[PDB]
Write a protein that binds this DNA or RNA. Structure first.
Ligand SMILES: [Ca+2]
Ligand SMILES: [Ca+2]
Ligand SMILES: [Mg+2]
Ligand SMILES: [Mg+2]
Ligand SMILES: [Mg+2]
Lengths: 152, 153
DNA sequence: TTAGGATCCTTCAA
DNA sequence: TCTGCCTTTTTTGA
DNA sequence: AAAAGGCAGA
DNA sequence: AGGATCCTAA
């Protein structure tokens, strides 16, 4: 677990509150115990012209990668343990996405117990809804109520 | 009056401006100005109006400027030359993507007195406007230093 | 089964 | 003439 | 985001 | 920005 410089975290928190996204998803999948998987992602988008700024993030954060979609590029961090460490340090400085960050942390902490009980998995799905409600969500499909058909 | 801004504020805000902000220089045709154009310099931060509270707070923090709504979004705007120069002076050290535009704005503001004095000097400052627009993701710009160049009266 | 990655779309919020 | 505000539009860059 | 414009008082 | 869906090593 890298400890990040405070002045870097201050600047990055501002940048993230601007061009960043803290995303939580429920994805249907038949192979998973409760027929769904949780996915958590920290992302920063930039026009591919400024991909260099994202390549620098990779180096400064120490983990994650940059993916180019053509017009725009994304810094992506998904790996659970580094994500938890990163958001823990970032969160105090966030002003617009602080709640989403803290919901992500809470979800991560509950993942072990979420795989053992459908009631617990559902509850955790409800925190995912909460993150989506905080985001400017516009194309969401799978919600905790989708999951609530573990009511079989 | 030359408000002094605090370090942790400037650091966070520099980040946020590199994200959702814009540092804009324009040449506005206007027949009642000395050389038939007015230079306008703007610092702007955009956000969805549901988050206008964040922009209103920027008025309190920067201590000048104002917020306007427009469709589904809001903008903090600072265009007043003396405070804008003071603010960008202190913000610039921490900018990463918009540092050059901020410094060009400062250079422009410092030359304005003597831009009113020579057409050739007015033209050169206009080329600094050009450079800022180049650095930005410019897509609907119309009036450029070249427009100004006649002026060949 | 699980976790992370790869690839792409949708609709704005800049 | 000048300068602080205002008010809308275009096209993405998120 | 990054322009385009307009009005009015000093 | 904020999702969606497919894939495959572990
Ligand atoms: Ca919302
Ligand atoms: Ca450009
Ligand atoms: Mg934003
Ligand atoms: Mg941006
Ligand atoms: Mg943005």
């Amino acid at each position: 677990n890298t400890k990040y410089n405070k002045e870097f975290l201050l600047y990055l928190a501002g940048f993230v509150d601007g061009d960043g996204s803290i995303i939580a998803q429920i994805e249907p999948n038949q192979s998973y115990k409760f027929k769904h998987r949780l996915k958590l992602t920290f992302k920063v988008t930039q026009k591919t012209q400024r991909r260099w700024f994202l390549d620098k993030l990779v180096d400064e954060i120490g983990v994650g990668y940059v993916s180019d979609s053509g017009s725009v590029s994304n810094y992506i961090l998904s790996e659970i343990k580094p994500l938890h460490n990163f958001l823990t340090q970032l969160q105090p400085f966030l002003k617009l996405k602080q709640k989403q960050a803290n919901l992500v942390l809470k979800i991560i902490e509950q993942l072990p117990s979420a795989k053992e009980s459908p009631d617990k998995f559902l509850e955790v799905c409800t925190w995912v809804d909460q993150i989506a409600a905080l985001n400017d969500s516009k194309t969401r499909k799978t919600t905790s109520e989708t999951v609530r058909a573990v009511l079989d």
